[PDB]
């Protein structure tokens, strides 16, 4: 009794750490992940046109599943990017607190990329609390769309819930870690072990995102291969192994449709970003065994799991990628340097007008 | 100074008349439509697996583009579609009046298939004014989608629009000659050579569709290839070749952008109807030349237009269908029989729970 399901997309992956293209994209696969699109917080960060042609080449050359490389927003490079910006899965905003080569230290920076940036090409945005707000105010003055990255709060779901009632162009996406803990899997994990952002909300906010799944346009891992000697403080969870079998459970348990989580792991990914499809590629997924979430997953170099304990009734068997078997019962069989850039594809470039 | 378009899906058309598979579908990729959705109300109308095999095999003989083939909810098959149901592209309600076959005589009947269609495959609804809230009711007493076809009036959409912002399941489709074509129009046209279902709306319905675009899921022509001998009262406007000249014009005028449009003629169809990907499929088309419609198109059979006078500023001038050129400025090169039913292609199945 197993279910084909089609080419499964992440759109929201930090591989670059001991985690690497190779290492990740196993990770992927392993959770019949075939697309993933790398954000770039790296060191080096991705953020000019030589630093993105190194990162390009070493995912051709390490990547085992397809990927597209998001471009980030700097303090000193808008409207420099406009002759590589097609060639990015979109433009990175990272609008809390993060490092100091993708900080922006004005909301004028942030109207500066949402006027330089190529107006059909995606723009991605961290933004926690507020500054969901702030951000849905740029893109109104700029007359352009603009995604949020993993919502957590009950707090930004209503928020970009009454955006799109009033016609906005608003997507967001969620990720897992925000969807099957709160704050009191924070007694079973602490200050270390546990740092992520944004924060773990509430039962309240757990319940939001549920009760708000129609204004969940997309689910994404937030896939950050930190090691527990880092994070016992480094944010993030690795999740592109336990993502799709968490999920899967919940479809199990009636919580969301089989289609909606294809609408929000497939359709909508490749909508709101422009991606191709993946010729001859499809997961096989079986849905008649239970097991519990190890201490660590086998192929994350994370070498650690927060949703360590979870009961879950899915399995990833079986995973084609573009006519060869990739992934199967525990092992990965497309060697390093298998996955391509969807971009240079000639049905991965956004349509745009003369 | 060409633009590259998807593959573009039309999921609204009505094939058996004068008009047939290789006729209809010829005016289909003049207009730059690569798949379509035949509708089952022809004669004989499709309302069993034996109707459905035979016009299965009719449109792969004669279609010259790729397809699926709607079946068509009757007094008397439901419960009985079962096996075939998912050979289909879906289900269709004709809820208002209609050919005494597809009339549904009680809402218990609209629930009765509600109940028995499989809950993973597609519904579509002909629901014109209050008919459009009875349709949703049902959907939520069964607790499923439902896609409502050729939104016309304001009342129509504005009530989907508060389904959508209580988080109900609800698409829907807009045709161009309600986003195009008004009451006014009615005096250069007559009850004869006007008749349509629904109606023409008023100058402030047209507004209020273009007003909530963010609504409108889908475009989609609902083709009606009756002749004039037959208007001048069955309803109904041919307009599988003006729709995209008309939209492209709508681009350029700024009132909307090129994504939304390919939002509305391909990710939103894909993602709803779950159609596959065309691989190697592509449209080209030129938005630097201005022309007046004529007073009927060249390939379809209807010999005539409703949209005759508009000015429009868009030209459909190559398309290519899986690897051959399907049409070049003016001549249909691919022949009868070319194109594919996409529910046989792996692809093309909606993924289901076992
Ligand atoms: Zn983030
Ligand atoms: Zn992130
Ligand atoms: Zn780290
Ligand atoms: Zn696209
Ligand atoms: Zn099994
Ligand atoms: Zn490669
Ligand atoms: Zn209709
Ligand atoms: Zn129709
Ligand atoms: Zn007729
Ligand atoms: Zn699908
Ligand atoms: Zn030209
Ligand atoms: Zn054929």
Same mark, same amino acid.
């Given at each position: 009794?197993?279910?084909?399901?089609?080419?499964?997309?992440?759109?929201? $992956?930090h591989?670059? %750490?001991?985690?690497?293209?190779? /290492?990740?994209?196993? *990770?992927?696969?392993?959770?019949?992940?075939?697309?993933?699109?790398?954000?770039?917080?790296?060191?080096?960060?991705?953020?000019?046109?030589?630093?993105?042609?190194? *990162?390009?080449?070493?995912?051709?050359?390490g *990547? !085992?599943?397809?990927?597209?490389?998001?471009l980030?927003? /700097?303090? =000193?490079?808008?409207?420099?990017?406009?002759?590589?910006a097609?060639?990015?899965?979109?433009?990175?905003?990272?609008?809390?607190?993060?490092?100091?080569?993708?900080?922006?230290?004005?909301? $004028?920076?942030?109207?500066?990329?949402?006027?330089?940036?190529?107006?059909?090409l995606?723009?991605? *945005?961290?933004?926690? +609390?507020?500054?969901?707000?702030?951000?849905?105010?740029?893109?109104?003055?700029? +007359? !352009?769309?603009?995604?949020?990255?993993?919502?957590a709060?009950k707090? %930004?779901?209503?928020?970009?819930?009454?955006?799109?009632?009033?016609?906005?162009?608003?997507?967001?996406?969620?990720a897992?870690?925000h969807?099957?803990?709160?704050?009191?899997?924070?007694?079973?994990?602490?200050?270390?072990?546990? =740092?992520?952002?944004?924060?773990?909300? /509430? !039962?309240?906010?757990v319940?939001?995102?549920?009760?708000?799944?129609?204004?969940?346009?997309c689910?994404?891992?937030?896939?950050?291969?930190?090691?527990?000697? %880092?994070?016992?403080?480094?944010?993030?969870?690795?999740?592109?192994?336990?993502?799709?079998?968490?999920?899967?459970?919940?479809?199990?348990?009636?919580?969301?449709?089989?289609?909606?989580?294809?609408?929000?792991?497939?359709?909508?990914?490749?909508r709101?970003?422009?991606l191709?499809p993946? =010729?001859?590629?499809?997961?096989?997924?079986?849905? %008649?065994?239970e097991?519990?979430?190890?201490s660590?997953?086998?192929?994350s170099k994370?070498?650690?799991?927060?949703?360590?304990?979870?009961?879950?009734?899915?399995?990833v068997?079986? $995973?084609?990628?573009?006519? =060869? $078997?990739?992934?199967?019962?525990?092992?990965?069989?497309?060697?390093?340097?298998?996955?391509?850039?969807? !971009?240079?594809?000639? +049905?991965?470039?956004?349509?745009?007008?003369?």
């Amino acid at each position: 009794k197993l279910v084909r399901l089609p080419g499964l997309i992440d759109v929201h $992956v930090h591989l670059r %750490e001991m985690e690497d293209f190779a /290492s990740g994209t196993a *990770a992927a696969l392993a959770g019949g992940i075939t697309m993933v699109c790398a954000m770039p917080n790296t060191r080096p960060p991705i953020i000019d046109a030589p630093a993105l042609a190194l *990162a390009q080449k070493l995912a051709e050359a390490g *990547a !085992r599943c397809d990927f597209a490389l998001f471009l980030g927003a /700097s303090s =000193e490079n808008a409207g420099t990017l406009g002759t590589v910006a097609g060639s990015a899965a979109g433009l990175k905003l990272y609008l809390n607190e993060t490092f100091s080569e993708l900080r922006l230290d004005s909301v $004028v920076q942030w109207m500066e990329h949402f006027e330089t940036w190529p107006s059909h090409l995606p723009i991605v *945005a961290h933004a926690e +609390q507020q500054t969901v707000a702030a951000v849905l105010m740029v893109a109104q003055l700029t +007359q !352009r769309s603009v995604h949020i990255c993993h919502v957590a709060r009950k707090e %930004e779901i209503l928020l970009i819930k009454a955006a799109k009632a009033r016609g906005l162009p608003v997507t967001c996406e969620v990720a897992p870690h925000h969807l099957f803990l709160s704050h009191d899997d924070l007694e079973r994990l602490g200050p270390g072990k546990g =740092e992520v952002r944004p924060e773990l909300g /509430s !039962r309240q906010d757990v319940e939001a995102l549920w009760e708000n799944m129609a204004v969940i346009d997309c689910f994404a891992s937030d896939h950050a291969p930190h090691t527990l000697e %880092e994070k016992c403080p480094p944010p993030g969870f690795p999740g592109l192994e336990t993502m799709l079998p968490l999920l899967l459970t919940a479809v199990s348990e009636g919580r969301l449709s089989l289609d909606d989580l294809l609408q929000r792991l497939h359709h909508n990914p490749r909508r709101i970003f422009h991606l191709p499809p993946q =010729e001859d590629t499809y997961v096989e997924v079986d849905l %008649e065994h239970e097991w519990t979430i190890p201490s660590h997953m086998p192929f994350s170099k994370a070498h650690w799991t927060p949703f360590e304990g979870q009961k879950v009734k899915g399995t990833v068997r079986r $995973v084609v990628l573009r006519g =060869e $078997v990739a992934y199967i019962d525990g092992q990965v069989l497309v060697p390093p340097g298998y996955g391509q850039d969807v !971009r240079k594809w000639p +049905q991965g470039a956004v349509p745009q007008l003369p």
